[PDB]
Design a protein around this ligand. Structure first.
Ligand code: GTP
Ligand code: GTP
Ligand code: CA
Ligand code: CA
Ligand code: CA
Ligand code: CA
Ligand code: CA
Lengths: 420, 426
């Protein structure tokens, strides 16, 4: 009746408790919460460290989850790396919030560091029976996966379908290449000192007849999830290289071409040798290619990236840290990284210049970047006012809608490139 | 001859069965084991659920351990929340390890008391015979020490005996009593370290640092006795003592000498958890006739970046009083630039690790140069800590570091000596 490994109640027992909780709810109009907790990227840990460590980490997390709740509450392992939590007898519906953060914050400390995404389903608001509530909380949890990770999300009518949609995309992504469904769009970069074009970024567009245009931000995670990141990443790299190689012949220089590089790709053994090859074929000087690695990966409290990163520098490729400013980071480790560029996350820029918090952190990032001799570029710049603000504050480069949204090669060349 | 409540054999009966086993062990030349099991944080269980439940829990625990062992094996209640176990016949010492874990995993599942089920844990010490002793008392003693070791190296764990374990266990107990006494007899002492400004060259304040000398043990370092306090629940009493005395002295100094900057005091993580902190702090200031502006509370980064929603609201409350807030040991590990701004900080203290390498080390320079730029941008009074050499102070000045603190200025001084060395008349 209890999970042997963790000693926690099983799915069955839980649903018995939830029923009593539901009776309690309708008898004494006292709302409740069902939280679904799934661990962030646990396979990589099982492979990286082996079951021995895994089975242990689960026991540890189990305990720490219990130590965060009251005796009235219930914590169960639902199977796999998934814990379902029952908060009955909430005085107010908003209480589930404070208890959610506690649970999420239990993971901030170490155990070996792991993370988890939480989905909240309130009752009876979001369901009046066990299967429905469990099903919804899960759907919420998936939305936390959808929106980055290591976060909590609430259930909303729509996001049950959004969850099953993402699942569908994973299988279709396998056919993406066979069908001519992948494209590269290009976005210009602007330096504020001068008024000149200083480079561009390649973005991956995936089209599907059922689901329409899929966004790059949502595309890569999917490719990672279904283990196609390598094959797809290679396709993206090569086509980026090809495009730059072509432009070098039919158009005047505008700087380097930028591309997102997934951690999984950084983990490959033949990457550096692969890139050499690709750069040679297109007749490209290595520095003409810029690889963007997202901060959250680099700052996973495990400096496994250094080794490879230096190789890429010895190759001559430019390295940029992407989506910087959010979450946790290490200043010590930030300097040890051979980076040329630091990209300011959109979130902080979208608020410029009105919001003082965003403005405050933008300055901090700007000043931090110059101290560590890194070129600072702001991404998501949407208004002339933001550009002006960033210009005074001494941001070096901008990228976003003020200049141009992503464009197809032809339109991009047509609009921004000159002859030579 | 049996524990009434649990139905388990008491220590007298256990002793005879241990003695008999020892006899067989000598002749037959066979190894054995005595295991000491002490429930983990069971006081909290009684506090939150009450004896009636705790008794049922003990009864439940006792019965589950019984099931985990052979017939030749015997489980006994030594007394309180402590159980003791004997493994008479072992093929080899390796076998004891195996049996120890069995008993651990028995605490994995929760235990059933009335309607509910609660999880309890335990620490386990192991003593082998005749390796670790050939008589009952020393085997129990040594097995107990290992339990205390398991108790100190963490919990819900197992530990084997080692020659040095007994002393460590007693010392830890002694230091507790001595701390408890010192705290209760005002036998701790505050030392004071000056802070200088590089922008001017005049005093900018001072830090109050807790010291503890004991003739029998000598100077007990804070690194040693603060965890002790945290472990045996004396940190709240300690922090309160530190605050009051830190205030008193400053107040007294407000009258006697002239204003020389504010006084900084470290605020342990748990002190922030105190619900009455703000109420209590205000009184402390009022009593000493100290403007809140005169007092600064230093809080370690590692803790503040681990903070919750309850912590940020308090930090505001502390500012509402007018006291200054400072982030201590800054830049070492992983932190959040986003969360750093939302804090109403006034001061930023650069960790001693980055400043002790100045200026020869290239990395430590880059980071120190970064932290200054960071603090400046956020409008935070940046201050170097642990400044030892002149070359280090030089560097910090050419790199725009506002304030400074360390041996280069002066080591922590006793009150009289401080007042006589850095303090001028009202
Ligand atoms: N060590 C251990 N691993 C388990 C256990 N149960 C499930 N897992 C692992 O948990 C992983 C589940 O991964 P998913 O939830 O599919 O995806 P993920 O790798 O966690 O990454 P996300 O998609 O971010 O959740 C699998 O690799 C399982 O082998 C267990 O009892 N012990
Ligand atoms: N209900 C009940 N409680 C008992 C009995 N005997 C001892 N206890 C409790 O067991 C607790 C023993 O606490 P300690 O061993 O001093 O420390 P702890 O709180 O267990 O924490 P540790 O440092 O991990 O041992 C006390 O709070 C006692 O009240 C008993 O017969 N019945
Ligand atoms: Ca998972
Ligand atoms: Ca899962
Ligand atoms: Ca990017
Ligand atoms: Ca105990
Ligand atoms: Ca300090």
């Amino acid at each position: 009746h209890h999970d042997p490994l963790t000693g926690l109640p099983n799915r069955l027992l839980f649903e018995s408790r939830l029923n009593h909780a539901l009776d309690e709810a309708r008898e004494e109009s006292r709302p409740g919460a069902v939280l679904f907790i799934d661990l962030d990227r646990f396979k990589h840990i099982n492979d990286s460290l082996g079951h021995p460590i895994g089975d242990l980490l689960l026991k540890a997390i189990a305990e720490r989850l219990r130590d965060q709740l009251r005796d009235v509450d219930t914590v169960a392992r639902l199977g796999g790396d998934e814990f379902i939590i029952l908060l009955p007898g909430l005085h107010q519906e908003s209480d589930a919030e404070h208890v959610a953060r506690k649970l999420l914050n239990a993971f901030t400390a170490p155990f070996f560091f792991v993370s988890a995404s939480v989905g909240i389903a309130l009752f009876p608001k979001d369901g009046d029976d066990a299967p429905t509530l469990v099903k919804n909380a899960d759907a919420a949890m998936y939305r936390a996966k959808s929106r980055g990770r290591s976060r909590i999300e609430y259930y909303t009518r729509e996001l049950t379908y959004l969850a099953t949609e993402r699942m569908a995309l994973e299988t279709e992504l396998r056919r993406a290449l066979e069908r001519d469904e992948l494209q590269l769009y290009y976005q210009p970069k602007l330096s504020l000192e001068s008024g000149l074009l200083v480079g561009a970024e390649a973005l991956v567009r995936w089209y599907h007849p059922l689901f329409g245009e899929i966004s790059p931000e949502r595309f890569i995670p999917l490719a990672e999830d279904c283990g196609l990141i390598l094959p797809l990443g290679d396709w993206v790299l090569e086509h980026a290289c090809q495009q730059m190689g072509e432009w070098q012949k039919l158009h005047a220089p505008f700087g380097p071409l930028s591309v997102n590089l997934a951690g999984a790709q950084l983990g490959q053994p033949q990457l550096i040798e692969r890139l050499e090859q690709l750069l040679e074929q297109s007749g490209l000087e290595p520095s003409r290619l810029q690889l963007e690695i997202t901060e959250s990966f680099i700052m996973n409290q495990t400096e496994e990236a250094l080794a490879v990163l230096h190789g890429l520098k010895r190759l001559g490729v430019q390295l940029a840290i992407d989506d910087f400013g959010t979450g946790y980071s290490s200043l010590s480790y930030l300097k040890r990284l051979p980076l040329d560029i630091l990209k300011i996350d959109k979130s902080f820029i979208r608020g410029l210049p009105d919001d003082p918090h965003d403005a405050a952190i933008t300055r901090a990032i700007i000043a931090l970047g110059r101290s560590m001799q890194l070129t600072v570029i702001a991404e998501g710049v949407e208004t002339e006012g933001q550009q002006s603000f960033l210009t005074h504050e001494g941001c070096e480069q901008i990228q976003g809608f003020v200049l141009s949204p992503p464009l197809p090669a032809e339109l991009f060349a047509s609009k921004f490139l000159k002859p030579r």
